[PDB]
Structure formats: C-alpha cells, structure tokens
Amino acid sequence: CCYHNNRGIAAHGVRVLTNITVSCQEKDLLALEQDAVFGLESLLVLCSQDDSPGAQATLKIALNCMVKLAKGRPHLSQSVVETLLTQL
Amino acid sequence: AHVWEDNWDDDNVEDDFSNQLRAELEKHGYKM
Amino acid sequence: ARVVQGSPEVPGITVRVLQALATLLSSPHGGALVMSMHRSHFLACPLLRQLCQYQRCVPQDTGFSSLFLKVL
C-alpha cells in the first residue's frame, strides 16, 4: 500500500512504514529503513506537481513522516535531507 | 496535521498587535 | 537523450543510487506536462526502452528488480 497508485493510501502506508521504523529496534527490520526513505521521495514526486487540496494534505502527511523518520533514526537523516533538496 | 510545530507563520496565529501591524503595513507595498 | 535513458535503465537496474532519482524526476515532469498537455512525448520512449531491456535479458533484470532494489 506504500507502492499503490492512489495518493491517500500511499500516505497511510508510508505513515505505517515510518512508524515501524521509528518504533522498536529489532535487527531484522533494518532493511525496511531503506524502503522507507525511498517511499517518501517516491510519494513526494507524485504529490508535488498536482496543486489540489487532497495533494496538499498528502504533502502534509508525507512531510510529517519525513520529520519523524529523520528524528527517530538520525543515520538515515542525511540521505533524507538531500532527497528533499532535489524536490526543492 | 502541521509539519512544523514551532512555526511562527501559520494561517492564523497572528495576535491583535500583529493584526493592526499587518493592516497598516501591507497597504503601502513599497520598500527602499 | 532517449538512447541515454535506454542505456541507463539497465545500469539503473544494476546499480542506480542517484540515477533512478534523475529518471523519476524526468518521468514525472513529463507526466505533469501531459497533465497540461504541453506536448509530453517522453513516456513512450521510456516504455519502449523498458520493453527492449526486458526483451534483452528478462531473467537477470527481473532478479535484480525483485531482489536487490524493489523500491526503485
């Protein structure tokens, strides 16, 4: 559901993946971290060029997930910020 | 549903003093 | 640079790191142009390049896509 066509279901899925990443630190989840960060930028390049209030809410949800993901795991964070500059 | 919690500049977070400041300050629209 | 995009699709399938981001930024710009219908004849060339790359070496590309980089 993070790799789904609809924007809102993608936002909910990337929230779920971000929340799994920020939460409990078992080893055999760390690969999802990589998936997580790519998911954000993928969703971002879907919801940047749309200019609709639903897409604006998707921007809100995605950027809140970006902040929380960079907050929980700082070693992803640098990759996080550089991807953001690309869509800037 | 807000990204930045310590944002000074939201849609409507402007107190009264800033409200009359904006009212008398946006009208001129020129800066040197 | 349609031939350059077709060549880098196999390199992107092998190892992309940052080239996949450039490809995604190029494709969604064409998608936004097609939303405005501003003569966006760029997705068909990438689709033909992807079809040719799939027809060249289907199994190695499929294994790299479904094993190494599922996200991209």
Summary keywords:
part of a larger assembly, 3 chains, B: about 30 residues, mainly alpha, elongated, C: about 70 residues, about 75% helix, Integrator complex subunit 1 (chain C), 26S proteasome complex subunit SEM1 (chain B), Integrator complex subunit 7 (chain A)
Could you explain the architecture of this structure?
The longest helix of chain A has 20 residues, at 53-72. Chain A has helices at residues 7-22, 30-47, 53-72, 74-87. Chain A is mainly alpha-helical. Chain B has 32 residues and is an all-alpha fold. Chain B has 1 helix and no strands. The longest helix of chain B has 10 residues, at 16-25. The radius of gyration of chain B is 13 Å and the shape is elongated. Chain A: Component of the integrator complex, a multiprotein complex that terminates RNA polymerase II (Pol II) transcription in the promoter-proximal region of genes.
Summarize, please.
By secondary structure, chain A is mostly helical.
- Structural shape of chain A: globular
**Strand proportion of chain A:** under 5%
Q: Helical amount among residues of chain B, as a percent range? A: 25-40%
Quaternary structure state of the chains depicted: part of a larger assembly
**Biggest sheet overview of chain B:** none
Termini separation of chain B comes to 38 Å
Task: Return the string of H and E elements of chain A.
Answer: HHHH
Radius of gyration of chain B: 13 Å
How many strands appear in the DSSP assignment of chain B?
0
Cα-based radius of gyration of chain A, to the nearest Å? 12 Å
Q: Report the total helices of chain B.
A: 1
Principal-axes geometry of chain B comes out as elongated
Helix content of chain A: over 70%
Q: What is the makeup of the main sheet of chain A?
A: none
Count of helical stretches of chain A: 4
Helix-strand pattern of chain B:
H
Structural class of chain B: mainly alpha
Largest interface: A-C, 12 and 11 residues
PDB class: transcription
Keywords: DSS1, Integrator, intac, transcription
Entry title: Cryo-EM structure of the human DSS1-INTAC complex
Chain A: Integrator complex subunit 7
